[PDB]
Swiss-Prot record, chains A, B, C:
This is UPF0173 metal-dependent hydrolase TM_1162. The lineage of its organism: Bacteria, Thermotogati, Thermotogota, Thermotogae, Thermotogales. Keywords: Hydrolase. PANTHER family: UPF0173 METAL-DEPENDENT HYDROLASE MJ1163, UPF0173 METAL-DEPENDENT HYDROLASE MJ1163-RELATED. The keyword Membrane does not apply. The keyword Hydrolase applies. GO terms for molecular function: hydrolase activity. It comes from Thermotoga maritima (strain ATCC 43589 / DSM 3109 / JCM 10099 / NBRC 100826 / MSB8).
Length: 227, 227, 227
């Protein structure tokens, strides 16, 4: 099987036959319970978009672990110049890796890479649909509500990670609509509570989304579930 | 109560408990009836995307009024470096300000910021759904027809500003389709006639859109309506 | 009438009253049967997005032929600084040229322009809907599956070029879903086989898409069809 750990914000660690981390915003993440040294051996890094609180410590983690970063073409070009190993994809594209299948999904957001003083173009933002041993995980990344999420309903997602913080992403209300579009077996709220600007009523989300027949698992940073 | 004035092209002004201007392309706008001096006290500035005919005089207006620019993260970064006060958001995110709620809506467009001879990355383009005193205003920004507009149907928008100029945006035919998808109480056409390249038959738009059951108010630049 | 020639990868040549080429990745394209010299007189060049394997030889072809490049505002700005004639548009915008109508369609992808070692921002990616003498050609460009494709169903497209290579774009299974959304009279697969990373079972695509009631025409690079 596999162990899926939420480490705060948009961060998600997947431990199976290979170890995969999504949007590794670790150092500088005020709600992340672990340091970089607290992570296990990392094989793959998934980056949804270029923003600092998602790209995060991908360069350091990749180099330390000899890990491969999976992201869009533009983000992978940026990382390639830093001496990071990459497997470039793009939106709606999928590839079968040794551990399983990764598919980039559409998102409505931005993908600017802040490099010192300059905003570098990091392609278009995404989510990830990950298929491991028949099980399906959806990490929406940063996104607003979008009708492209309806395309995921036929996938029969087991666990969906959705942002609920609002302002930069979907709020509670729109996240509930997203859950109804996607119809995952379980939903985990994320990308909230990190700062005051993205405070969200997570208990209200659980209540509202479970009224729509979708099980909601509120994971505190550090907590995990099994698939 | 509030007064909503179309200044022609993409330009819009909302006067209520606070004054809000959307896409302030004033100086250099051949169809704009006012100078910068003609504008009242501005509290907030909304920028849909980075193109010059929408970004416009955001910097000058912001500084002279001590106003806050509301836009996406990448645009707010660019403006921040020029000494402008900002409230960063992104696509599908909303925030409750003192005057009311602003929500960024997805749009199909570009968002290049022309600085000198360089094309700076300005995130992804957007529209704005503005909720003030129970009234809803939709400013589509620059956009082509998109299925995301159907998400606004349940909002029961009071006034929708849609581009009809074509070429850079929806033409008359697609704007009619957008109006039917959104089904607002009123539609106001915009972003046409400024140059010959974006000539549109605005009277034909009114006829066609009203045949589909959506009232069209053709506002000349300078003309307003009351909410 | 007109002759439509697939020249491998995303490349498509349309020969009629005027000569139009889409995404002219000629030199450095190992599956393209022709050299640049092998192209006829080119009147217009269509560029879906900034990636090198689509932008291709647009600059050189344009200069040699005194041709006009049709692409989004940001791409046309880049090309403009290299002394290329351009007609700028954007997503969902259309314009009536002497040969016929061109409309930019939404795509879910990126649009980075690689200039030396810098990733220049090239707007948002697109497809093209081209109307010539009542005939409609859809070139999807690089894209994942998107609900925006359903907007094209009412057009009754005659020929639709869809990528099936996977990884960077739709794979076989998603391209079939796209074909069903669009319901063209004919579908031609493309953007596969060029490298090992984008290998695709083109015969399986034909079989599966024709089961859904859409005729599939497999064109090897160099082959053509009449409209
Ligand atoms: Ni974020
Ligand atoms: Ni973000
Ligand atoms: Ni514009
Ligand atoms: Ni624009
Ligand atoms: Ni490509
Ligand atoms: Ni591409």
């Amino acid at each position: 099987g596999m162990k899926v750990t939420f480490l705060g914000h948009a961060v998600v660690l997947i431990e199976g036959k290979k170890n995969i981390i999504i949007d590794p915003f670790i150092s500088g993440n005020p709600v992340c319970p672990v340091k970089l040294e607290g992570l296990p051996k990392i094989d793959y890094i998934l980056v949804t978009h270029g923003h600092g609180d998602h790209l995060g410590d991908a360069v350091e983690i990749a180099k330390k672990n000899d890990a491969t970063v999976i992201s869009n073409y533009e983000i992978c070009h940026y990382l390639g110049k830093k001496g990071v190993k990459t497997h470039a994809m793009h939106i709606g594209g999928s590839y079968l890796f040794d551990f399983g299948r990764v598919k980039m999904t559409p998102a409505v957001h931005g993908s600017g890479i802040l490099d010192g003083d300059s905003m570098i173009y990091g392609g278009n933002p995404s989510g990830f649909l990950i298929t491991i041993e028949g099980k399906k995980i959806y990490h929406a990344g940063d996104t607003g509500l979008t009708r492209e999420m309806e395309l995921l309903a036929e996938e029969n997602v087991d666990v969906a990670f959705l942002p609920i913080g609002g302002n930069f992403v979907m709020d509670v209300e729109d996240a509930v609509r997203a859950a109804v579009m996607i119809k995952p077996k379980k939903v985990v709220p994320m990308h909230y509570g990190t700062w005051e600007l993205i405070f969200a009523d997570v208990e209200l989300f659980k209540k509202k989304v479970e009224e729509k027949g979708v099980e909601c698992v509120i994971l505190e940073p550090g907590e995990s579930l099994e698939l």
